[PDB]
Amino acid sequence: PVGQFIPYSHHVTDTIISTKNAEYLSVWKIDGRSHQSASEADVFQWIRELNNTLRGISSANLSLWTHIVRRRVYEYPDAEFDNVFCRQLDEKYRESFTGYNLMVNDLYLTVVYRPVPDQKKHRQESCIKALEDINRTLGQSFKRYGAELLSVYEKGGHAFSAPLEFLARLVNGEHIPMPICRDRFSDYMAVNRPMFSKWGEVGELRSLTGLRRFGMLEIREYDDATEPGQLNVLLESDYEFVLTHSFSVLSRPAAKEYLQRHQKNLIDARDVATDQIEEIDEALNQLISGHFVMGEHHCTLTVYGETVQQVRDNLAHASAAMLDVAVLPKPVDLALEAGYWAQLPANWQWRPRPAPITSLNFLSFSPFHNFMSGKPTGNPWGPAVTILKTVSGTPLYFNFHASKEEEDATDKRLLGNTMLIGQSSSGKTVLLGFLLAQAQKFKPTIVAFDKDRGMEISIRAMGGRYLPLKTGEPSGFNPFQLPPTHANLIFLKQFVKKLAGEVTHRDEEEIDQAITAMMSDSIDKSLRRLSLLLQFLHARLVKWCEGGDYGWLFDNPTDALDLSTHQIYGFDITEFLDNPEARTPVMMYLLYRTESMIDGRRFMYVFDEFWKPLQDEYFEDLAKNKQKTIRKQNGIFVFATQEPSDALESNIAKTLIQQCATYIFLANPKADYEDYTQGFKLTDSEFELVRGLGEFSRRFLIKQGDQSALAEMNLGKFRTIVDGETVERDFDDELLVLSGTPDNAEIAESIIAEVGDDPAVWLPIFLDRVKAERSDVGSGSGS
Amino acid sequence: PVGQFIPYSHHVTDTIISTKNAEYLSVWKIDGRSHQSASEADVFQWIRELNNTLRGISSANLSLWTHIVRRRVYEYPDAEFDNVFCRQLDEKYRESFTGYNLMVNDLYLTVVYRPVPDQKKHRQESCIKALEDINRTLGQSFKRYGAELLSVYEKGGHAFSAPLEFLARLVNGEHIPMPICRDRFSDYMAVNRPMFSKWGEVGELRSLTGLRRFGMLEIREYDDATEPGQLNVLLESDYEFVLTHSFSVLSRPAAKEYLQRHQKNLIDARDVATDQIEEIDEALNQLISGHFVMGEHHCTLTVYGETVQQVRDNLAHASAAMLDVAVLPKPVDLALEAGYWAQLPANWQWRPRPAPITSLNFLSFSPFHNFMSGKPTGNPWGPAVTILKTVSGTPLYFNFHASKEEEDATDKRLLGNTMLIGQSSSGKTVLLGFLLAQAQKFKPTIVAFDKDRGMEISIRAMGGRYLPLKTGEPSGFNPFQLPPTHANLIFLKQFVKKLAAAGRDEEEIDQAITAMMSDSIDKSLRRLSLLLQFLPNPTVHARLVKWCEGGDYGWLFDNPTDALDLSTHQIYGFDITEFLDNPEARTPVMMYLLYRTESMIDGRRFMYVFDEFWKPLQDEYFEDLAKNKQKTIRKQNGIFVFATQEPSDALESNIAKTLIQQCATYIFLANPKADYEDYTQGFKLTDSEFELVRGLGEFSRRFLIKQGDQSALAEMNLGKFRTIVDGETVERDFDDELLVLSGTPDNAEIAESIIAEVGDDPAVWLPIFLDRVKAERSDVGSGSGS
């Protein structure tokens, strides 16, 4: 049958998996350091640190199985928006990938402990303690690597097994979420059994997504040298394959005996003393000195597909890309019937060929892969944008919340803050408008604070509120002046930031309590109450000058209910570089209102030049306490500053950098310098990349946690429906997200003054008309 | 398994590999000598020179194994052009090759020294010295044979050891690049494992690319009367075969004793086969003097294919083609298995029948005769173009980077200068355009100096500039001379070459003119106008103004700048049509053009193109800068290609003879005139190659291509149609012979139309205007006048 060939039986604890041969397993899901944004000394230092780690995690009680699974992305739920602009953008982006081969490649590392009644239970508990020590040391040496211990999807429904299903994805060919029952896992739990041909050419695998066929390659006689990332040319890899590097650790005297027999072979060659006995004696010296640790090893690449000519084509391309880098893959005959059963990490019996390798040549073969999202689908929301063009590589799946320095991981969901920095108008607002437009698939309510009349047409076409501020016109927000919790506290803050220990600090709290007790008795009084509050018990200055603050509650009604009608809200903080005269009270009560509003969804506070308005100590107290409370309770801050080396002088910017998850560096030219390496936590290669992309390349360095790569937008794509359609250029709905100020501002104002409700169906029609007039007559006629 | 049948062990030195029985191999690749160019009686002289070499290194430790491998060439890449006209020409030429005679054959020779603890190391260190001596001898003897000693290939990505890959090709069936590693080669070479069954079955070879089958033919006859090319009739056939000849040298007592045994059985005892007893006595005295060397020799023909009826058909067709040359093949039974392991050059065990033959009957059965075929890959650039219609169908794979007897040091990549010889432009311009398009395949920086408005449509459609430079139109000023880069020396040389024509060393006077000209820093047309309006204050500004003629339209001086894409292109062209000396017109404009285009690109693909190359290079400055420019530009990846209309007029000069001496690929087009003591003296042909060039004809564009020491005829043949395609609606080719051939009244009107009638940078105005050329000239042009 099939159940005798798969050795697992979960009977111990969360991370450890027992079996019938009394072995124990523990699976890690890693997404390692990117192999595109680092120097050669950095990857050499990484391999040296990993070898110094694995030198202690040794001594014959260990088997490490590194799996590199390149898999299609069937789990991605591309869905609808229920507004026509964002659905049009999703349609253009989804069919803007003309054969991009959307595959993601995750890593796994299986740690297997094998030692060689109540005493057997004691030995089992000793293996549990020993493997927990191994897992603790491995997690302490994988802090840069993003290695989540994979006993993490527990208690979903009725006790689902997370160190399982990866051991199903090897054996079934599809990620089936395994249930834990009081039974054995080898009975009939692994459902989709594969079958083999009688000659052993290509095996078949009857999954639920369709019948597949697979072929394998075994690596033998690899090169005597070892590049650190030597076999990373199989990550582009149009294969949907599974790579398995098994290293079962041999002890020191067993490895010394193996080199003794190898020297006996190389010295008793029939009159060919090939002078190769000078590096194996050096290897014996490194073994006795303790610099190495050797063990048995086999590498199997199982490439999947269908229509066996295509499987053989993939096998031939894999053999070509392997022999390019000086390893020799032999194909497999009927021993493939054992080789797939050598895929599982409890398979010393059906092991194809145990080549003894040193640990440096094992870490040099599986060091780790390029950059993707560690959770493509599975975030606290859905995946925001399937960003293409990690440059010559996989997709991105850009998320606002990925990871951070994982200390005290409990009592928090995930840090979600992002810093979308870049040079002034060099491709910042188009990316921010695109991300805020694409994020609407799981219903957030974004609140934006602009730089200078930017992102206007995007938020206005999304259905947003977007009041544009001018401070002279009476159309503006009014002081609401009715919280029945700490009206005295907000009267204190209003008095001190209206006079602008402010000036003398003499009994202003008595003025606040007097105006509260004389005016508010108790609830639901109108502009009579607001007029008493404005008049008597900005303040003295506008009271004696009559000019400069018309936009506040100066015979303006209580516009306080306007935070349940729309979803996107937008305020222009353009003419407010004169803080703390005007910018900090306005944003003080705006952030007061919009922080009293928390609707449970992702409240995305979008800032443009966040260091400009937040220049008061009240916003420092908010950037401590409110930032902790909002990044706790399903809130997301999206900053976009422009001059970060001019922003780094304030400590508010420092404490907002230190609590920010994902960074985007867009178009920083050579005018900026080595201060990206300190504060922003970069290496030298990442700053070299962001300075070497140039000025008008419109691609950005994305960095999440300890991973970094590049990303583009690719606004040139076309599709083929039956014959090859026209080139779309992604230029329809591109001037609406770029937000050129005069055309979009004038036409948006005039056609919200022409048709009443804010349209997604009628605003871009005449917006397209008024943009096409300029873009056709002004740019084609005169030459 | 198979690891006991394939006898190889580790590399011992750079070029010598080992065996599990302590034999030492060294693999040469022999780009063999071209035999269908001189095959009257010099073939016997080549065979006698090779036998006089092989008698020197007789050395009964030795065993030679030579392999003729016909391979269906797959490594020639598809040519992505990123153009429209040149891509159309590449598509038309690629569909022009349905001529099924692909399969380049390459010839290898493995020298196997078989030497019959620390003493074993001494044995190895003596066998290395002996095989290095034999390698030096065979290198000095195969100098004209295009030899290359296959070394350990020190950078593929780490180290890739490539005499081993050919040793893989005998056992695997494809060029598998075998990486050198910490394991003997007997355990990991045989990737594609063979299979054999029983009586009535040919061998199977289950490769990853597809299933293959193979049969074997064994040479077993008592034939003596051999010719030096008796088995090159298979060198044009289509089997994808591997033909192995093995010759292990018999020792002198064993050779004399077995020759005594065979002569007792043959030339004596009352039958004697009269009269075959005469050669044996003098040959026995020659063997006691060593003039013969007898050796165990066998030969197998492994014929590859698929669909075993087709393998049996190819075996029967090879049987007929070898029965044509009085050789009797035999099919191989179950000993095919052993016979397949008879191909690897360390197996004296699995040999079919080690019958002894002499050295001349081994060097005559398998000499290094080869149809000329260039490198498909491996050249430092991309391969240029394949051209068929050579000696018996096999393709050529033309390449500029072909070796020579020069390069005493291996400093540059490969010598790559080329020149065409032909009279009256008899289809020269079409060949130069057809080479320029397939050179535009791998993006070069072409600079051309055309003769009389030729190559103008090809350059203009290829993304070129093509200054007309003519003293006859209402326009014409295209020269600037304004910014100085090598100011004092080069503009001093240009001034003294512009004014110095009086019959007297005005060098310091011109130096003071340049010193008063440079006023002061970074000046424009104001500075050039100051240079024009400097006072006379003898050889003076008078002849300068009167030999620019005043309002210098055809001339170089008194111009504005023409700064428009002088460096941001890929193809530049100039004309020297109305340029002849007295007055000195052609030399300063050529000096200025070579000076400005010297430092165009230092490092990437550069190709100087010259038409009538002996015409501008006449003065002594051109000799000095030609020698220095060759010596410093051949290292900086700048190759040349010349073309002349007369051989004898080009051989009249001396610096032109120096440039002839340093070329690397000659293409002799067509000469019925054929002055005898110029082709064989200056351009270095033999007598039979010159007779070939004379008998080539006068209008057909069949040309003798000679590169290295190989020579073969070729025809580019852009006049051939086809018979089938996927879109079965049209199967004839007609175009692109009227755009590269570039008749000057067509090119003048194409330039006038691209200036005034339409206006376009790329080749997008072309095809209806090509109809406006062709159909309009055929209907209302030549035939119907008025």
Residue numbers in the entry:
A (entry chain A): 15 to 130, 146 to 529, 533 to 569, 584 to 829
B (entry chain B): 15 to 130, 146 to 532, 538 to 571, 581 to 829
What's written in the study?
The T4SS also elaborates a long extracellular filament—the conjugative pilus—that is essential for DNA transfer. Three ATPases, VirB4 (also known as TrwK), VirB11 (also known as TrwD) and VirD4, power the system.
We first solved the structure of VirB4 in its unbound form (VirB4unbound) and fitted and rebuilt the structure within the IMC density.
